[PDB]
């Protein structure tokens, strides 16, 4: 009952070569067959690689598999990269009765500037604390790649209930846009310190922050 | 061409029951094993279940055990997910997939059918200000903002000072939340010098419960 780890997302530029990564958290690797699925966006997924490396007819051989047991990973490279190839991937493997996928990883082949999330935390309003409820509203706009996480502390402590995050948007001018929430009680907002939105693109966070006691 | 011809599907409320169709052709059915996947809206694929050519052999993971059955129809080239005591976890897009067996892999995968649980029902928003302070300003810039909670079914228009207000608007896609409620929020920018001059007003619609909000945003 393994699992199998690939990244939140890559990028590159077309005509470039990326690869993208996954790694079996227990057993080895090469003990079972991994395979790869392409899922572009609003579209039901298509097979890339079977077999670790085998190509279906019709995928052509920019879409490349292989495997690291020093790693315990399994990797899809594409060369060449074309927009036709933005989507996500996903791998899989099978043993005893259980099929598992990886969590899928976002594929932007870009085609303009990367842009770092601006990141605005607004804290529960008066008249919704007068209505017994709270929710702290985080708005991440104007970044690209269009992949983002969102985190939330309270005071220090990572939260793990009442969080609801939007999936990335394409905005008007081509960047993404996503938001978060945050459902608190009006005695839990007064009784922390601070809480805080953290949203990590590419590797580096950007974290806001409010207080109670403003 | 394979074809994987999908059907079924729709809307329920928990506890209720549904049955998914995956009609073929393009291969004799009797050949190969044959699988269930779904993908819950913005989430990764999950296996559903698999059946083995003839039936003898059937695997569930967990997360679906003791409710959902499949079963296929050889004769028919059509393979079935009967789902009962759904649950609001339960929405996703399911694909039906052919299988082959011993490369361990799905070859083909059919369109999808969407599966939705829910047991909310028309609700008119709950509008909050979001606004402006010391806290919400950067360089001479302040955000301010409307927060539009706990509606269903979709759409909300949002608009600012009537329509006189669209410089610097966005308003965000909804979060569909656990509650099975959405919420969204709409924010704008403005100089931080006209918060004493003018007025901020955020116009809500949402016509599925006949509810208009116009919410005045003022300054902390």
């Known amino acids: 009952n393994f ?6 997302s890559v990028s590159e530029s077309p005509g470039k070569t990326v690869t993208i990564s996954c790694t079996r958290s227990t057993g080895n690797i090469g003990s079972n067959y991994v395979s790869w699925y392409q899922q572009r966006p609003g579209s039901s997924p298509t097979t890339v690689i079977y077999r670790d490396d085998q190509r279906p007819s019709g995928v052509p051989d920019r879409f490349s598999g292989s495997i690291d047991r020093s790693s315990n990973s399994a990797s899809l490279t594409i060369s060449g990269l074309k927009t036709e190839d933005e989507a996500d991937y996903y791998c899989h493997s099978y043993s005893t009765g259980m099929y598992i996928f990886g969590g899928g990883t976002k594929l932007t082949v870009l085609g303009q500037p990367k842009a770092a999330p601006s990141v605005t935390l607004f804290p529960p309003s008066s008249e919704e604390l007068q209505a017994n409820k709270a929710t702290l509203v985080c708005l991440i706009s104007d970044f690209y790649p269009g992949a983002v996480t969102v985190a939330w502390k309270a005071d220090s402590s990572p939260v793990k209930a009442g969080v609801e995050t939007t999936t990335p948007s394409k905005q008007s001018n081509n960047k993404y846009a996503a938001s978060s929430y945050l459902s608190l009680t009006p005695e839990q907002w007064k009784s922390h310190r601070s809480y805080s939105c953290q949203v990590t693109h590419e590797g580096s966070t950007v974290e806001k922050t409010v207080a109670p006691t403003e | 061409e394979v074809q994987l011809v999908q059907s079924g599907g729709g809307l329920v409320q928990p506890g209720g029951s ?7 052709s393009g ?3 009797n050949n190969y094993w044959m699988s269930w996947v779904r993908q819950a809206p913005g989430k ?3 296996w559903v279940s698999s059946i083995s050519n003839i039936g003898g052999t059937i695997y569930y993971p967990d997360s679906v055990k003791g409710r959902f059955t499949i079963s296929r129809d050889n004769s028919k080239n059509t393979l079935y997910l009967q789902m009962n005591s759904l649950r609001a976890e339960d929405t996703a897009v399911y ?4 299988d082959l067996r011993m490369s ?11 599966v939705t649980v829910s047991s909310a029902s028309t609700k008119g928003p709950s509008v909050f200000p979001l606004a402006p302070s010391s806290k919400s300003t950067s360089g001479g810039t302040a955000a301010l903002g409307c927060l539009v909670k706990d509606y269903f079914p979709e759409p909300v228009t949002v608009s600012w000072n009537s329509g006189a207000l669209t410089s610097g608007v966005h308003t965000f896609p909804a979060v ?9 929020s709409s924010v704008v920018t403005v100089p931080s010098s006209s918060l004493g001059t003018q007025t901020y007003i955020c116009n809500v619609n949402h016509k599925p419960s006949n509810t208009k909000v116009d919410k005045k945003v003022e300054p902390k």
């Open chain 2, 18 to 24: 549904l049955r998914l169709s995956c009609a073929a």
């Open chain 2, 27 to 29: 291969f004799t059915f």
């Open chain 2, 104 to 114: 361990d892999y799905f070859d083909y995968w059919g369109q999808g059918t969407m």
């Open chain 1, 3 to 8: 699992m199998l780890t690939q990244p939140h």
């Open chain 2, 176 to 184: 569909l939340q656990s509650s099975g409620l959405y919420s969204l």
């Open chain 2, 95 to 98: 694909y039906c997939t052919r």
């Open chain 2, 44 to 46: 990764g694929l999950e």
